[PDB]
Subunit: 63 residues, 6 copies
């Protein structure tokens, strides 16, 4: 199973490593997939490049 | 955050619903993100359109021994 | 540039055609890119395969009150 | 509605912010989606990593 | 590595199988990656959902002269 | 035809340029697509952000 998670920049090394373990466990538990068959990519996006309601997360945090 | 999952066709509806919930719990506990801020999109690919080693999952299934 | 849109199933053909045009005009005006250099791909997801808060759009629709 | 735009690196901060506003307006106008329901990610790609006709945009600009 | 291809609908099964193999050989020779480490996912888009210049491939096909 | 290749960071400039040429040739050969109609994006992912079996490629290399 392939999993891509896109989230905001600024996460700790712990958080990214934890996320990759935990998403893998979730797929293994719910689908029966061997853990080695679960592949995860974490993509981090700067807050100036993520918009909700037409305003960036960087602006929404400021305003 | 956005979680996009690519799976082979043929999982049951109950397994897909359980996966959505469990991936969401995993992002909640590890990142602190509220569950309502986590989105999951599950895409299913037919086995003729997924290749490993240059051969489709369908072809690899037809010769596994 | 490439614009990939993910939408729930059920939009009309006319709305999808109008979206493609309008996203293209938006990229043209803001970036200067010629319209012919903008590509848009629209993907439709069934509501059983889109989750928010760990529950599918289908499940959230079945209990909205 | 979720929108991912991939474009070449080197855009100004104005251009990215403008793009996120304008794509959001387009989705709101054409689908009736509340602006808060439109989410946009802008991904920027270095010109050495985008190919057309088997040559990078960086090479095509040089040559 | 992961190779995701987006194609218009309508290619034959034989062409899609040949593409998967050939993209895999290309990644093997240029990167050194073993073939079994290369995955290819082929996605097909209907021509009403692919836009260039703000018009769908279907619309551009209906007026090409 | 559009092709996105995600692979690990650390590739040489030769390797990325070669990959973009070779993937383009493969699409041209197998589909009959004019080379100018083949578009390729190469995305590079740090090894700490790619997981197999719940462990990052960075950890798997160390351990």
């Amino acid at each position: 199973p392939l999993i891509r998670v896109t989230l905001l920049e600024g996460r700790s090394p712990q958080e990214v490593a934890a996320l990759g373990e935990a998403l893998t466990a979730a797929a293994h538990e719910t689908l029966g997939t061997p853990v080695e068959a679960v592949r995860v990519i974490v993509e981090e996006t700067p807050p100036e490049r993520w918009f909700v309601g037409g305003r960036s997360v960087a602006e929404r945090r400021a305003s």
